[PDB]
């Protein structure tokens, strides 16, 4: 069986909009959701879906793009560091379950080569 997405809203959890969470979702978020390589990573991994037997066996703390964005417009984060590690558990994420060169591999590098550069303009809060 598939485990529940994440959570994306708790209303004990207290809220903030900052230019930085701002920038993540309206530039980020939105490029790397349309590019050529996004559609693998815009939901959780569907490991009935795909005949993923052991994917939750072997991740442990699952995170995808579709989390990422409810996480962002929900103004579930405090901090910009916050979803920056959600992307950056979503990428090892990948990496773990696969292997170097492998098709998803390249498709996830390309995205984190994309997210690099965005973060490298994030603005200063
Ligand atoms: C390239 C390709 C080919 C095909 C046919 C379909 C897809 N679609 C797709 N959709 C969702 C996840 C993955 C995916 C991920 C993966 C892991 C972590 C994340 C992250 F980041 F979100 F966490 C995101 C993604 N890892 C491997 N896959 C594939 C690898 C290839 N298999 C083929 C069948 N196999 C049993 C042998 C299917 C699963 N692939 C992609």
Redesign the pocket.
Same mark, same amino acid.
């Given at each position: 069986m598939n485990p529940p997405p994440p959570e994306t809203s708790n209303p004990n959890k207290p809220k903030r909009q900052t230019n930085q969470l701002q920038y993540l979702l309206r530039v980020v978020l939105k490029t790397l959701w349309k590019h050529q390589f996004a559609? @693998?990573?815009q939901? @959780?991994?569907?490991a009935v879906k795909? $005949?993923?037997p052991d994917?939750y066996k072997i991740?442990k703390t699952?995170?995808?793009?579709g989390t990422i964005k409810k996480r962002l417009e929900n103004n579930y984060y405090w901090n910009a560091q916050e979803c920056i590690q959600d992307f950056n558990?979503?990428?090892? $994420?990948?990496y773990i379950? $696969?292997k170097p060169g492998?098709?998803?591999?390249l498709?996830?590098e390309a995205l984190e080569k994309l997210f690099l550069q965005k973060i490298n303009e994030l603005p200063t809060e």
């Open positions: 559609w @693998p990573f939901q @959780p991994v569907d795909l $005949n993923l994917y991740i699952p995170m995808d793009m558990t979503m990428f090892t $994420n990948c379950y $696969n492998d098709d998803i591999v498709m996830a």
